Scaffold this active site. Sequence first.
Site, PDB file in Angstrom:
ATOM      1  N   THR A  36       0.836  -1.239   0.000  1.00 43.33           N
ATOM      2  CA  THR A  36       0.000   0.000   0.000  1.00 43.33           C
ATOM      3  C   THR A  36       0.856   1.269   0.000  1.00 43.33           C
ATOM      4  O   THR A  36       1.897   1.325   0.657  1.00 43.33           O
ATOM      5  CB  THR A  36      -0.937   0.043   1.230  1.00 43.33           C
ATOM      6  OG1 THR A  36      -1.743  -1.142   1.269  1.00 43.33           O
ATOM      7  CG2 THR A  36      -1.847   1.274   1.197  1.00 43.33           C
ATOM      8  N   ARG A  45      -4.106  -1.112  -5.212  1.00 43.29           N
ATOM      9  CA  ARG A  45      -3.683  -2.515  -5.252  1.00 43.29           C
ATOM     10  C   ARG A  45      -3.897  -3.191  -3.904  1.00 43.29           C
ATOM     11  O   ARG A  45      -3.483  -2.669  -2.872  1.00 43.29           O
ATOM     12  CB  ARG A  45      -2.207  -2.642  -5.643  1.00 43.29           C
ATOM     13  CG  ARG A  45      -1.681  -4.071  -5.562  1.00 43.29           C
ATOM     14  CD  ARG A  45      -0.208  -4.173  -5.909  1.00 43.29           C
ATOM     15  NE  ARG A  45       0.042  -3.956  -7.332  1.00 43.29           N
ATOM     16  CZ  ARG A  45       1.222  -4.118  -7.927  1.00 43.29           C
ATOM     17  NH1 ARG A  45       2.288  -4.505  -7.235  1.00 43.29           N
ATOM     18  NH2 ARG A  45       1.337  -3.891  -9.228  1.00 43.29           N
ATOM     19  N   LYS A  83      -9.172   2.273  -0.881  1.00 43.00           N
ATOM     20  CA  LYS A  83      -8.525   2.411   0.425  1.00 43.00           C
ATOM     21  C   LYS A  83      -8.918   3.710   1.130  1.00 43.00           C
ATOM     22  O   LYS A  83      -8.532   3.935   2.278  1.00 43.00           O
ATOM     23  CB  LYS A  83      -7.004   2.335   0.267  1.00 43.00           C
ATOM     24  CG  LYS A  83      -6.555   1.215  -0.657  1.00 43.00           C
ATOM     25  CD  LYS A  83      -5.083   0.886  -0.492  1.00 43.00           C
ATOM     26  CE  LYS A  83      -4.650  -0.148  -1.516  1.00 43.00           C
ATOM     27  NZ  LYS A  83      -3.225  -0.541  -1.351  1.00 43.00           N
ATOM     28  N   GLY A 105      -1.979  -1.618   6.169  1.00 46.35           N
ATOM     29  CA  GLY A 105      -1.781  -2.696   7.138  1.00 46.35           C
ATOM     30  C   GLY A 105      -2.744  -3.843   6.893  1.00 46.35           C
ATOM     31  O   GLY A 105      -3.032  -4.181   5.744  1.00 46.35           O
ATOM     32  N   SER A 163       3.714   0.386   2.800  1.00 43.77           N
ATOM     33  CA  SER A 163       4.966  -0.176   2.290  1.00 43.77           C
ATOM     34  C   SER A 163       5.657   0.746   1.282  1.00 43.77           C
ATOM     35  O   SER A 163       6.880   0.713   1.141  1.00 43.77           O
ATOM     36  CB  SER A 163       4.719  -1.546   1.653  1.00 43.77           C
ATOM     37  OG  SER A 163       3.829  -1.448   0.554  1.00 43.77           O
ATOM     38  N   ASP A 167       7.328   0.683  -5.579  1.00 39.76           N
ATOM     39  CA  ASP A 167       6.999  -0.300  -4.542  1.00 39.76           C
ATOM     40  C   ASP A 167       6.175  -1.442  -5.132  1.00 39.76           C
ATOM     41  O   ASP A 167       5.178  -1.204  -5.820  1.00 39.76           O
ATOM     42  CB  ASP A 167       6.228   0.364  -3.395  1.00 39.76           C
ATOM     43  CG  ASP A 167       5.912  -0.598  -2.263  1.00 39.76           C
ATOM     44  OD1 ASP A 167       6.782  -1.423  -1.909  1.00 39.76           O
ATOM     45  OD2 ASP A 167       4.789  -0.521  -1.721  1.00 39.76           O
ATOM     46  N   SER A 186       2.495  -1.776  -3.951  1.00 36.47           N
ATOM     47  CA  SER A 186       1.532  -0.801  -4.464  1.00 36.47           C
ATOM     48  C   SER A 186       1.440  -0.858  -5.987  1.00 36.47           C
ATOM     49  O   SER A 186       2.409  -1.218  -6.663  1.00 36.47           O
ATOM     50  CB  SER A 186       1.939   0.605  -4.028  1.00 36.47           C
ATOM     51  OG  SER A 186       2.345   0.614  -2.673  1.00 36.47           O
TER      52      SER A 186
HETATM   53 MG   LIG Z   1       3.253  -6.618 -11.839  1.00 30.56          MG
END
Ligand SMILES: [Mg+2]
Lengths: 196, 196, 195, 195, 222, 204, 222, 125, 212, 222
Positions: free
Chosen positions: E1, E19, E33, E47, E129, E166, E169
């Site tokens: 995230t 995602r 989210k 989380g 993250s 990331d 995400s």
């Molecule tokens: Mg991919």
Amino acid sequence: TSIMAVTFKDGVILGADSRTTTGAYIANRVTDKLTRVHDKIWCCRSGSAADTQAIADIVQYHLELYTSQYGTPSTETAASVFKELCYENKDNLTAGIIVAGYDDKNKGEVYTIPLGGSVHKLPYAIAGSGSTFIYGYCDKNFRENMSKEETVDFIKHSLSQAIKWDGSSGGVIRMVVLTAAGVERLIFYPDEYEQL
Amino acid sequence: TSIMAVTFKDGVILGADSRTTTGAYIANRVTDKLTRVHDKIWCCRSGSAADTQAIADIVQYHLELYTSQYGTPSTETAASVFKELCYENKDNLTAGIIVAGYDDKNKGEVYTIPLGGSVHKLPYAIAGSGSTFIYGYCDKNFRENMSKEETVDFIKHSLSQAIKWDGSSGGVIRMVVLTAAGVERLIFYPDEYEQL
Amino acid sequence: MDIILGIRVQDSVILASSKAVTRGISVLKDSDDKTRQLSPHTLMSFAGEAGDTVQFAEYIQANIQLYSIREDYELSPQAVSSFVRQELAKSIRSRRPYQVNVLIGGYDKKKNKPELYQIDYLGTKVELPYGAHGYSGFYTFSLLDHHYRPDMTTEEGLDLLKLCVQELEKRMPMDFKGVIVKIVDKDGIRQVDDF
Amino acid sequence: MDIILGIRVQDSVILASSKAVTRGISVLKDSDDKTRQLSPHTLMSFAGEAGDTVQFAEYIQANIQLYSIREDYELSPQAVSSFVRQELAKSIRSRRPYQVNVLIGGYDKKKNKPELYQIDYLGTKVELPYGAHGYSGFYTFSLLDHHYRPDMTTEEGLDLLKLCVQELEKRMPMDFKGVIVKIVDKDGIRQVDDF
Amino acid sequence: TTIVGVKFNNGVVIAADTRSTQGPIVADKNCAKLHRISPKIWCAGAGTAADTEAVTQLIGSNIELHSLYTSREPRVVSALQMLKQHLFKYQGHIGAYLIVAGVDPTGSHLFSIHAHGSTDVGYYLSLGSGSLAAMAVLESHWKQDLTKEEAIKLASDAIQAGIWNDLGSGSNVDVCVMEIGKDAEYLRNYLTPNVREEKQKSYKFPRGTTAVLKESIVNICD
Amino acid sequence: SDPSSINGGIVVAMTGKDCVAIACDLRLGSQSLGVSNKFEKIFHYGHVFLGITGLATDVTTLNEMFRYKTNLYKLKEERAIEPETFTQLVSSSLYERRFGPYFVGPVVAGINSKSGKPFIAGFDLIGCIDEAKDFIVSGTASDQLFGMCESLYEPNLEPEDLFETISQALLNAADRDALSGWGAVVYIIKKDEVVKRYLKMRQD
Amino acid sequence: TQQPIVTGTSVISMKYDNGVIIAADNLGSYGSLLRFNGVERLIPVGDNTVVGISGDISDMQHIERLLKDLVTENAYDNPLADAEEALEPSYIFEYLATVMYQRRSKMNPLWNAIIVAGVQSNGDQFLRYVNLLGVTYSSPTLATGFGAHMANPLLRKVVDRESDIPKTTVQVAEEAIVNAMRVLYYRDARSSRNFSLAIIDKNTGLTFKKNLQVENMKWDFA
Amino acid sequence: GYDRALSIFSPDGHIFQVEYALEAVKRGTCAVGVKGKNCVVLGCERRSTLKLQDTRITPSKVSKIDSHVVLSFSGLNADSRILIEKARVEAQSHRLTLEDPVTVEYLTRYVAGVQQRYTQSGGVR
Amino acid sequence: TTTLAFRFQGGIIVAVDSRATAGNWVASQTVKKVIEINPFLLGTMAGGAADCQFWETWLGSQCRLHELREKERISVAAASKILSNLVYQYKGAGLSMGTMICGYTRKEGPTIYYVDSDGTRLKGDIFCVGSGQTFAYGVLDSNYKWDLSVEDALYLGKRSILAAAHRDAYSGGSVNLYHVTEDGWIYHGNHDVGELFWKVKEEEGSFNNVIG
Amino acid sequence: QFNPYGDNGGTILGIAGEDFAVLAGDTRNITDYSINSRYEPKVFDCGDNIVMSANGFAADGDALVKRFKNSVKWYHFDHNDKKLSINSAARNIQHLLYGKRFFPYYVHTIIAGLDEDGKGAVYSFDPVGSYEREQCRAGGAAASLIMPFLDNQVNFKNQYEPGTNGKVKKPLKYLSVEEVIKLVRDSFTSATERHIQVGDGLEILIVTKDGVRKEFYELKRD
Ligand SMILES: [Mg+2]
Ligand SMILES: [Mg+2]
Ligand SMILES: [Mg+2]
Ligand SMILES: [Mg+2]
């Protein structure tokens, strides 16, 4: 332990407390942690007592054999031998050593060798459990090209504070002065340094 | 963290860095670790951020209810409430709190409360991970009955060194002045304190 | 592996050894002979860790057979047992010890006497009128303490042995698929086919 | 405990359960009946942790008997099995769960059909033509996959069951001291004495 | 995230990626989210996914009841207080990491909450993250006195940094703008820079390809 | 001793043009031992369909629990529960056991009777709702199902075409998983007719 | 089997049109203690290669000695030691990569993450990574430790793929590197303000910049 | 270790140490082997310059290698013991791994290989 | 895996499945678990796949060297003992092997040896080896007679693997059949369980647990 | 304690035709939740019309490829420049892998080429040397996603002839290179959608009697 070495105008001075610890019991209150590896190259010892002695003895042997063949070794050379032992045997050693010596060309020099076995050439160095409590004080009070009397006072005041806060440090403050004049041993007792 | 509180002629001053950590990542570089529990009773916070907040919030609630019934609480009373929470919940807390307040009868007072939940009334107190590096400096430089400007310089220089050596400390130096005159907030940025 | 027994009577030594070989939840074989002839008048039964047992038994067998050819002579049961003990005594302080327990039944032709030796994987040797390895002993020793006499015949020894197998088949948790019985006497080694 | 089997045929359910009770290196009993009659046309066999098994079986028995008296009526096998499943489903999230696996064989008088339910200690229920708990299934399921037919008689079911016991007696490591066989049909529950 | 929050002139803006993962597998390629606690107080959560949704709904419910009880519009500090005391009580076992933002009669506000119950304040924050990738962008481009359109650009750019760099995400960027004196403006799929390319082939099977054993009509009626 | 992979099994759901499909395998085992080949994992309460994978005792328990709850719902509400509402009920019920959860992977499927809109949804063990336009997957071969669905799926498939797609997705996913298979069932769901088909698949 | 004692944090780098840039701060940490401040973690080899090292400093000093010895050994019986047979960046890297993977295979690693930056004899830019595990990879931007999480996202906005390299000047590239170092000082608890930076250009050669400081920082919003 | 190449070629292509070893065989007591239709017989000479011998304990000229194979020899007696010992060990080793006693050809091939090895190994005659 | 081999009136039947697994992941359905050492020797593979593959092909090289040196095909006993002595040297190192060395020679006749990675070596008439060995035993034991015809023996071996392929989650794919006679081994085809199960169910009337 | 292994992610895929074979692999390289490189090739031409990839722990993967490439070189030196057949290469790779049985190369290896009859060949290995020839194999992080799709579309598994009552299977046939590349591209785009460690770029190596050709395609970078 609390130990340190400080370069100044005429050379370098080493300093140390005198406490040996096995737990909270003081196994020796009059220990000599300042050790000779050559005429004017000395070391300060911290960590394991067995490890630091085995190392210092091997270094002293190496420099004695160096002298027999190639004459007086440099302070850098002495530090390199300490490093070689500490680095290559890093898994089995607990030794924090400060090396300090006097050349006539290079004057006073200080090399510190932490746990990993890295080498760091510095104007002055502090080490041992009690050093943590005097990083602030030493950084604020150290100056380059101090006199003998100023450097003695700097070390005396510094180790006094390290001793005051660290339970693993105490006893007398020993010092060793390295200059062109020769080698001088100094000692300072609790009744003096405690009330600074 | 690096935090401290220092009594002086006109009252007491609290000081703190602004760094919040989760490992080596700085989760917040502009943190406010100096917290109001009453008009002229403030705390410095170290340890767990969740724990210290939960405690400070409960204390603030207790002193607000105290004030409604019995008027202004003493600094000692505030420290006792902090102690009661820290001592009775010692197994589940990681909180090192310094309490500091100004009475008109008692003037400036400082109480420090370490991990166990013991109380210690002192002329000045230092705490947090970075405090270790300034025990030597603070002991050598603290005097009783300092002026406002002297005390500000003492805290600024002290926390500057704590910040310099402790990776867990940094950012800005916040300070809170507690006197009869009122409450004054001070801030000091890196460009000033780093080159002290 | 599991059950190995031994009884020394007046004129012979009788060894009984279980036939089952079990791995996991499967009995892989029900006719396994857990013994090797070391010499014409010496027999060794064995039990313990898989693989180790046979490897050790055959290794001892090879050594005794080598000795027999070299000297054109048969080692005494006492001599063979001491050789075996020392090998196990070496083994226990090796990098990977043999986890094998053995019984050695032999007939000494010079003394005209049967002899039974019990040796564990540590190299612990004892001469006995009757012996057992593993959990078997917890039933058979007390049984034999009661019914055994030193002057019994081979036939009396076999009946005494039947009494042990019956008790084990009644009270032991595992199915060991019966036993192979062998007799060692003045005329050598022979197998009882109907037990 | 250990071996419990079940086979549903045309007109009956047949349960076979081992007779051995073993603790340590001793078979303490060789005639143990690992079953309880819950109602006139419902039988439950059980296996698992010592103590838990009987305690659970008798507790269920008491509850079903209580129901029978209260309503003057016999619960269906399906109803009894669901009650038992829920008790085990409660148990698995208790402080100390019942470690008991059961088979429930019953004859539904309203449907005129035999029914066999397999329930484990987690509360996992399935209706099956044939069932087993523990290591038994690793042999019997494949055997029954081959030889079982849905239209078999009770006698054909018993022969099919003999084939399972023979296989287990050949390949299982432990001596389970045979089985007690019981039949559940339209006329209730009866025991086969010669198996 | 990746979730961020950014303060501006007359309010506050929050954003997040879309995602959702279970291990290295992408479960939802367009999950939402951005949560609503009250009409003008919105939450971004990272989380444990169920914990962030449950804790946001519980406090959202209690905030509504509180708003009705007091005849007042809910404040961000009330949501902050309730969330942190709830999370503290559970000693971090409820894995909810939140960025709380909104407007109320007191003004505009931006806070973060960590699972153990610690809260902090800021003009720009990032959690999840991809927070380090986002924070790098925020630290590089943030300034005092941002406009509405500048703050949206900065926020979405910070989320994009997480999306691209990331692995936790990806997919899209959701945004919610909370301005003082105006209705909160929720911008679902504000950016969609990860559209799936045309497949090379249609995998529509000839009818009858699948072997069938039984058919039957299922009764859904009474 | 991992509760979610003791018994084995899978469930998948898909949307099409004015229709939805939900499918599951029939295996129930105890680790390596296959025990039952008749263990269906899809249930329905009115026109709302629920598939559940994971620990079988919890699959059974939750079916019984949601039958209980949807029956009381209907009595009080005087109408059948809708997929959107039921999805919320599943989420609430699972999160109620936050620190002692049912080890399951449920999947809701159905058509809203008022709007006519096809609806699918998935959950983790503790109640997190996963809504999707296209497909939801669950079980021990979820990785395999994700791969099959992502490649095979296209939008707005007719009921007859959708059947082929979901069936092929399940079958080929199940054959790459040791703990899934042993038969399969597919539900094709239109506004007011539901067809149930058992698939022929390899029995190893 | 080791544990690192005295450590160095992030090393960051990128390619630009004519060469490569690499940077690293001057700190030697001892756990949370910021012990040594005069530590040079960029080590030039010849006039065409710079090796940047993070991780254990005792092992870094060992690697220094190896590279020093490599230059000596290459000069032996080599009339073209300062011409056609001079040490290339690719040679230096492969040597280190060999050593790192051999040491991990003997379960006694050099606890480091290394980036070799330089320019080849044909003018081509060289930039490649290797660490204690012997893992190697190349990219237009490369960074270690915290740099990987915070610097890479920023540097990738400048050079996102291969085609962006000719379009990137040394002025633009250095600006991005210097900015990244500031962001790391804000957010890495084991960073220092002082750092070194090195540029290896195919025309102007090796430029080594010492005693740089992070400047133009934003705190007043505190 | 003693390394000297003792067995080497001479200008005419002879290995004198091997040929001189044949002279030692020529000095040894006579041994004869004759095989019939269903048996083999090994005969051996024993020199009679040795009276006061104890024939019970004196090493016999024909040695059993296994229960089914025998070995007689001519030449140095001390040398023969080393070959016999090695052969006996190989016989038991073969039974252990192949689960079958040696063939006479195999046992011969082994003994011959040992002899050959001592003709091109350093430090040995 | 499930593998079996049994001795009977007309020689030896050898039957194996073809599944490979990495935990619950089905890695392959087309694996060759029988290795053809020579025209008269077969080896079965169960357990660690590299262990089995590497050391059994290595065994083949040792058997070839035997017949070059000894001018005679190696015995089944000696071949099996080379493998057992090899794995015994590696005992404790973590090798995982359940193998069966099957073949014919003049001196021995039809012979089967069980060899595993903890050093166990057993001569015998019937063995089943692998995770599904018990399922194979159940069918094989309950239908085994010495006097089975070549036709019936081939089927029983095939049917026993099928039984295990069905019940054991870690067995499946297809059945590979072999028949060993005095003239050597003869391959009797690859039989996919996908078709074989339904063919057997219909023709035999078995597998009534399954939905037809 | 020091852990000598790591996971560099990515996924690979090999398909064989009648007179050709392809070996494809994504170009992304990762550790944990970070991207190391968007273009780091792991499918290599090893000479003698053999292409190879060793996916998993990249350090072990590079080491193995390096050793096999070297094995091909010495095969020429020792056997009069003889061409190394794909079957011989496979057996050689088994010995390379099994040689480290008690300290394994942490990789799933796939090689592709033509057999000695000119027909397409794909071999796949487990980490310790187990191998098998196949028409089809996917490997690495997304193997579990792609492989069942390949079973269905390459080998026509679970597909029956329409109207034959599920009695007649769909007949096996070789696919054209055009059809195979369609399946590869669709396999990787699907894997990219649902696996976080897969993306950035796709590189396919095609092997015919004329040599080794390359094709590159962009993949989603989130
Ligand atoms: Mg991919
Ligand atoms: Mg700092
Ligand atoms: Mg399957
Ligand atoms: Mg199976």
